Amino acid sequence: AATHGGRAVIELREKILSGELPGGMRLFEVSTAELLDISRTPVREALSRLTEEGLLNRLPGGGFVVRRFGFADVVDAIEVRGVMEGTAARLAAERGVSKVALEEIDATVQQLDLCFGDRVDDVDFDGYAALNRIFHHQLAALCGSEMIRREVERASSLPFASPSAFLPDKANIGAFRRSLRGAQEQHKAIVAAIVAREGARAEAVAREHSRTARTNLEYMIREAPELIAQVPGLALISD
Amino acid sequence: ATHGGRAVIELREKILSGELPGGMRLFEVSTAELLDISRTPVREALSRLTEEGLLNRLPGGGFVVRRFGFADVVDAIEVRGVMEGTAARLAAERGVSKVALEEIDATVQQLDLCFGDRVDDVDFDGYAALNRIFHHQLAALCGSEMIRREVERASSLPFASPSAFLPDKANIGAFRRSLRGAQEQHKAIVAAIVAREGARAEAVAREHSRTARTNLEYMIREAPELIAQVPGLALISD
DNA sequence: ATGTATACAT
DNA sequence: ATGTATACAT
Ligand SMILES: [Cl-]
Ligand SMILES: [Cl-]
Ligand SMILES: [Zn+2]
Ligand SMILES: [Zn+2]
């Protein structure tokens, strides 16, 4: 983005996501302007856009604060993504999907199968993460509803709430590596349930799929607390 | 009390009535002149209305009034039901404080007094005011700020609100007679939460959102052009 | 049409 | 510390 407003959005987003501007920190207009070497006006533009994005909260009485996320908020965000993905999957099973959209999502699932070797640790991380992003974008749009697609993507927009969040390409942790086989079995079950018009199953399996991220998070809290801050998308967690 | 704040209220009203139709570009100078204020509180208002979901930011700059069709009304009601079902399920699974259960149960008891001896005999205004309280209490019941925030966001579009197709907005026989069933569901939601029955709490709270969808479907079928005259539906493009 | 800096107000 | 109007820039 070639504008001061636009640059400030990019610069502040990066500082917030990395934990450099921590959750709970008040972002004063004059202080933020001086930090970025611009005036208060492009700063207000940037603060408004970052509030719309959900990285900042507006304070009663004026001003902006970096929205604070503790482990309970991450757990709730992952729960919400799961519920929304479960809705996208159920509505595709209930309302029906076009022949081409089913073929495309089924093709992604078959390609995801090739990321797995003969050993339980033998997984192509980068290949998996790129295809996993595609699968979840396809799932969000599958029932053809613009509103559902929009709400599913919004529920997946916080870095820790993304279907890409706790994957071994972000952080090469044994637990994240070994969680991929199970997650892939769920991708297959989601597509088969949608083809079979099994809305209750499609919802339940897509919702359970989001529990991979929560299980991986719980493993880290218990097994390597300080490593959390070193995992991308988790540096901003206040706890 | 601010120009920014007043402009949010004034523009929201103009959007909800269809005065500023879906697809209309809201220029900074044009909107400033319309509200008799400068561009600065206008940009503040346009940002807040984008967060609310009544406007979209355009890729090359500017704001446009978000277009809503009938498919959007059905989808928004579906999403509110799913979110309310989640708030209900998490309260049942995690548990609720003694005071929060007492407060929501008090609202339900107050809602019982809106009903008479005849099936049509219902206090519409009393019901709608208490219904808003119940749904705000349900959203906050499990004590999670994130859930509360997301449930409220899913209930913010006029046609997606738990108040949307009630007889105080539009006195239609079907809307009147749907209230007894909806009240039995409020009682079932609270009892399922007290009993830690998360699957029941979710199912009952989700079904409770189907009252609005059933009432909408009734109007489309039985009185199609009367829909516009229903508040919160005047902005629907279809 | 919007971006940007700033004076002036509470 | 920010709400607000406005001149001037892009
Ligand atoms: Cl939409
Ligand atoms: Cl200051
Ligand atoms: Zn996945
Ligand atoms: Zn209700």
Numbering used by the authors:
A (entry chain B): 6 to 244
B (entry chain A): 7 to 244
Sentences reproduced from the published study:
The structures revealed Atu1419 to be a member of the VanR group of the FadR C-terminal domain (FCD; Pfam PF07729) subfamily of the large GntR superfamily of transcriptional factors (>93 135 members in Pfam database). Like FadR, Atu1419 possesses a characteristic molecular architecture, composed of a conserved N-terminal DNA binding domain containing the wHTH motif and a C-terminal effector binding/oligomerization domain. We identified the short palindromic region composed of 10 base pairs and a degenerated palindrome bound to Atu1419 and the N5,N10-methylenetetrahydrofolate (MEF) as the effector molecule disrupting Atu1419-DNA interaction, allowing the expression of the second part of the HCA degradation pathway.
The structures of two palindromic DNA-Atu1419 complexes solved at 2.79 Å resolution (P6422 space group) and 2.05 Å resolution (C2221 space group) present a distinct neighboring crystal packing with an asymmetric unit containing a monomer bound to a single DNA strand and a dimer bound to the 10-mer palindromic DNA, respectively. Nonetheless, a tetramer, where dimers AB and CD bind each to a DNA palindrome, was reconstituted by crystal symmetries in line with the conservation of Atu1419 tetramer in solution upon DNA binding. The three monomers of the asymmetric units (one in P6422 and two in C2221) are similar with an average RMSD value of 1 Å for all Cα atoms making almost identical interactions with DNA, although the positions of the DNA binding domains within the dimers between the two crystal structures do not completely overlap. Each monomer recognizes a half-site DNA with helices α2 and α3 of the HTH motif making nine polar interactions with both strands in the major groove of the DNA. Helix α3 via Ser44, Thr46, Arg45 and Arg49 side chains is responsible for six hydrogen bonds with both strands, half with oxygens of phosphate groups 5′ of guanine (G3) at position 3 on one strand and of adenine (A5) at position 5 on the complementary strand. The other half is made by the guanidinium group of Arg45, which provides specific contacts with the N7 and O6 atoms of G3 on one strand and by OG1 of Thr46 with the N7 of A5 on the other strand. They consist of phosphate contacts with A1 and T2 on one DNA strand and T4 on the other. All Atu1419-DNA subunits contain a bound Zn2+ ion at the same position as that observed in both Atu1419–citrate complexes. In contrast to the protein-DNA complex in C2221 space group, which crystallized in MES buffer, the P6422 protein–DNA complex reveals a bound citrate in the effector binding pocket.
